[PDB]
Design a protein around this ligand. Structure first.
Ligand SMILES: *[C@@H]1O[C@H](CO)[C@@H](O[C@@H]2O[C@H](CO)[C@@H](O)[C@H](O)[C@H]2NC(C)=O)[C@H](O)[C@H]1NC(C)=O
Ligand SMILES: *[C@@H]1O[C@H](CO)[C@@H](O[C@@H]2O[C@H](CO)[C@@H](O)[C@H](O)[C@H]2NC(C)=O)[C@H](O)[C@H]1NC(C)=O
Ligand SMILES: CC(=O)N[C@@H]1[C@@H](O)[C@H](O)[C@@H](CO)O[C@H]1O
Lengths: 50, 50
């Protein structure tokens, strides 16, 4: 589980392990999407869904 | 796989006496691709993995 409250703000890179479940509980569209990539440093194709 | 494969010879426009040098292929990689994968990364390579 993850949580954003007050000062806390978590954006940690998570390994994919060739497939993930995902679920979110939101009151007012807090989460706008994801980003998938391998290196994320000018070296590999990445995708954005928002 | 399910489909058809086609090929034809093109020496008329794809080659010349001085040669055409516009094409490249990747012979070094730490691991074989999975089906229909792609990698367009160009970087220095060293066998140590560093
Ligand atoms: C495609 O996946 C392969 C393997 O899953 C990735 O190759 C790994 O790259 C890291 C980079 O440091 C190496 O340490 C590993 O040894 C490699 N193999 C494995 C099995 O992890 C490759 O990086 C991926 N493609 C891209 C563009 O990143
Ligand atoms: C992605 O590439 C760009 C361009 O190669 C990087 O921007 C460079 O950043 C360094 C220091 O941050 C500067 O000294 C260079 O002058 C920048 N290049 C240009 C053309 O302005 C950028 O840093 C790279 N991304 C990351 C995360 O490092
Ligand atoms: C004014 C104030 O302290 N507001 C909240 C408090 O109600 C809460 O208990 C705490 C951690 O949950 O974060 C902060």
């Amino acid at each position: 589980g993850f949580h954003t409250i007050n000062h806390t703000f978590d954006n940690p890179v998570i390994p994919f392990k060739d497939g993930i479940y995902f679920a979110a509980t939101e009151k007012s569209n807090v989460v706008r999407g994801w980003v998938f990539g391998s290196t994320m440093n000018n070296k590999s194709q990445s995708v954005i869904i928002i | 796989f399910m489909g058809c494969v086609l090929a034809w010879n093109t020496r008329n426009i794809d080659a010349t006496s001085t040669g055409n040098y516009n094409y490249k292929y990747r012979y070094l990689r730490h691991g074989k691709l999975r089906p229909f994968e792609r990698d367009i990364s160009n970087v220095p390579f060293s066998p140590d993995g560093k």
